[PDB]
Amino acid sequence: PVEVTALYATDGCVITSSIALLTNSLLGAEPVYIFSYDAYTHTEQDRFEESRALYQASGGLNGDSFRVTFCLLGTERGRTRPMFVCRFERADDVAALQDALAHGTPLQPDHIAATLDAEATFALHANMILALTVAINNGQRGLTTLYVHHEVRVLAAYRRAYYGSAQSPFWFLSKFGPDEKSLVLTTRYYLLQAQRLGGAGATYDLQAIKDICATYAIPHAPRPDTVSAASLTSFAAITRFCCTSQYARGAAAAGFPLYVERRIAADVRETSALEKFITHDRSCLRVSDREFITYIYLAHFECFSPPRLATHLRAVTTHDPNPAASTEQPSPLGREAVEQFFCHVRAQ
Amino acid sequence: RKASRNALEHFGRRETLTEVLGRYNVQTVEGFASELLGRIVACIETHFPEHAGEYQAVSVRRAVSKDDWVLLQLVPSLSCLRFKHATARTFVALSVGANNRLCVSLCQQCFAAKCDSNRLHTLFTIDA
Amino acid sequence: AFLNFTSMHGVQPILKRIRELSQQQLDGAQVPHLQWFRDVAALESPAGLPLREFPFAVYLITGNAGSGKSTCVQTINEVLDCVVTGATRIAAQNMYAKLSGAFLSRPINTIFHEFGFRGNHVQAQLGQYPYTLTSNPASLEDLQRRDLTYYWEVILDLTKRALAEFRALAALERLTRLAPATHGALPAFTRSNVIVIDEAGLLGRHLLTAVVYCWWMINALYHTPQYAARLRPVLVCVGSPTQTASLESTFEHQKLRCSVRQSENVLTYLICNRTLREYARLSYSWAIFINNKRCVEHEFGNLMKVLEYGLPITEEHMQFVDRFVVPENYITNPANLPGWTRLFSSHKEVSAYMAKLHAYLKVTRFVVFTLPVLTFVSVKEFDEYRRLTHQPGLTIEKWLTANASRITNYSQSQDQDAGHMRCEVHSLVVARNDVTYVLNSQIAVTLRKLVFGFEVAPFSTYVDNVIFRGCEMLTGSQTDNYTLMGYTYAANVAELLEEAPLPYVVLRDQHGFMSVVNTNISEFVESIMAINADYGISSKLAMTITRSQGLSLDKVAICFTPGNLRLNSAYVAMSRTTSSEFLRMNLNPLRERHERDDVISEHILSALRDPNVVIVY
DNA sequence: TTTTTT
């Protein structure tokens, strides 16, 4: 019953091929490419150990049944949107998912269609079929007809919903970091893990999440295949570099979601404490006009000066994903700013 | 104070006027002014040639002496170089600018209202 | 990597405020009904218009140009429902560039397009009817009625055009929120209630109410799910309140004297109006950015903080800015400061300087060349207009005397070196002037590009063989910084354009691809007529201080006219460049008599002195 | 003095 969320892409147009696998039509269907995936089953170390078990180092998952909700980049603000859910429980189907989540081998249409959970797959499009019927008036059949008879509208409408789901491989290596760590882990979190797990990271931007990934310094091992990150050309090479990445099937894949939460908690403990001190004094200083600008530009230096910030980010950088074996240590942002500026501004 | 100590550590030291002038053998300001007075009068000829010849024989008398500003007059009533109103007094002003380099500014204080009554107005600033 | 940190962790309180501001349901009676907008259409004059309230929220994200207020719009876009807009096409494209550099942003248009502004509205009498506000204290209803009477000739036309969807999808599901998709080409205001207006200080106060008004329109005719949920618009206005201003132009049709007065921008309207600062609760809804990533020099940084916040001008500041003053005849001389943009405080001054620059670049041997530009006036339209102006005696050249600054779609037209127009009646009284253009100069479309072609030698390769004899090439068969290359050639005025070969000017983009653009045709329609065919390119070498507010510059030399010295103009001119090293000026704005208007400055200062205002570095 | 919206 292990549930997977999979961000897919195709070397061709995605919405075209996708709708063409929701009608069981052997006209247009292209290899699905799963480079991003989150697996879950219905404390912090209990969560780490549960995930490290599912994201088996061997490869693929550990559960015997899998419900994969294949998703595209769109808005249901959600960053991805479910397209077709598929239940692989049969031995062969579980075997092909494992070598597509662990090596990056394209999941052929016939396996996408054989496992199609039509009951819940068309439930996502049930409202879409109704609205298209009503609009054009002025189950699988619902779409087979709407597309065969009214293709442009369905394509453009499945293009308005599921917005910008057709981006190219350079787009991914540009917005999801040039590094392999980013390309795997940040794509997993920002798209398929942020909103589901909730927490503060649901409201953080892509650049912020990439910065958090940059400070997630889990021991890097020289890529075995020496595959260049820049060499990646098609969604075939992005997916390969990602699925066989050391950051995708084990401890790092299990520690990243917890580390996002930890880093934010430590940072806000300091940012919020110091914003309270800046807000008490901004409101109760009664100081000179030039001296007010001097104070506020001094307050924010003491709180966010590049050296102080560098020390703080080096104090939250990890060297291991296990929360009970983490190398992160207490940050000296707040304590020092209060012991070097705030008590002396409390000399009011 | 905390602003000044923190600015000295992030941006750099801006050397005082006296130290910068010491590089050009000035321990004597009214003599350095004389040597660059030629550059000053050359820029006057190039951009203000209609009043250039009033600046052929000029004596430099100190006006303001600070640790960041040195204003020095040029009595030989000279003419305003901005408008065409015997209405202005000329003042050479030396400060440290850019990468600790000496900026020599010709400034004129006129009396006519078009020019703020007896207020310093700069006209050109060159290096030394 | 640490540069983003403060923004990353300080935008979250902003995000955790806009959400409740957008998810606050109104009482049933307070929702503007459809019948309201039906009655507005019936009303002819904006006098019997009823005092009604159109509810709205604001969240002001203010700060200097270099503050990070635009990074906040990045975090908002990827987390919240929003319709990102811009006060100018340049600002909209700048936001698109900075939003697509992180994730996907849908094509960002202007707020004017969003509320339905069309061609005929461009030249519309937007200041005609009067209003004696039954006010002090000014009720919000009175302020909204003033802003609707101000824009009666636009609000009325928009309402009439909209009046004279989602209900079908509501009948089935009794789906609706999927109308933005299944039913396409629908206005973007029907799918969100958070409207981000960037550089909103470039919009006048009349627009604020207008936008809210229009919002309710487009959510009433279509009966949007937000209208059923009783949500209200929230206007996230992002802009610099002390580096941007809005101006209103009125043309008197007998004196032919086009006048431009200053106006209250949306930011100033919201900050400085006691009625709006209470209804919108600006204290709990402010986001003042306090950073200048475009200023690392400590000294230039101090001066820019002195001018943004209105702090006393001291002797030290005078001595610092003293190191920039270079003579009047040094800036204006084209031989000096090559590649430095020169700002003047008059369009005539720019028209003089550009002509002088062309003279220099021709006598000392870029290449200057006059390019054909024509003005197609209509005989009947002018005769009817002369009849209606109470003065039927007016020469066509006198028609083109001061209506030129108005017949154009871009202001830069009044600051170009051109030849004289012509009395060339066709019977359409066409006219013909000749603008001079420096080839290989900075050229900025104020058009449809058609790309024709693309270790130091240029690998010149094009789809067709080109021969640039002189300047015209021999091809046989707005934000983007283009490069002028040459003029290859390759309905009543359409026939004449077929007659006289219209030259298509060729531009070179940043990559180097030769993109051939088209021509601009613009109408004049104001009354109490003429379509102008020209090229619409700007040199980016000389401009006005007022237009400089829009875009940042690399190297700047400022020409200040004494007496007209406004410290806001000085601050705007001096803040367009990142580094104080590359900045030269006519005189010292701090040492000369300057009319300082420090009223909004103290308002920001009191905002920086309020516990509920979020100051993000 | 003073731009800008299609």
Ligand SMILES: Cc1cccc(C)c1N(CC(=O)Nc1ccc(-c2ncon2)cc1)C(=O)C1CCS(=O)(=O)CC1
């Ligand atoms: C604030 C700060 C934090 C961390 C690191 C630095 C470098 C700084 N800065 C840069 C800065 O303030 N830049 C800036 C300049 C002008 C404007 C502006 N305001 C209106 O229009 N533009 C806005 C921001 C300083 O200057 C310090 C230096 C040490 S200190 O003196 O202790 C405090 C100020």
Ligand SMILES: [Zn+2]
């Ligand atoms: Zn004078």
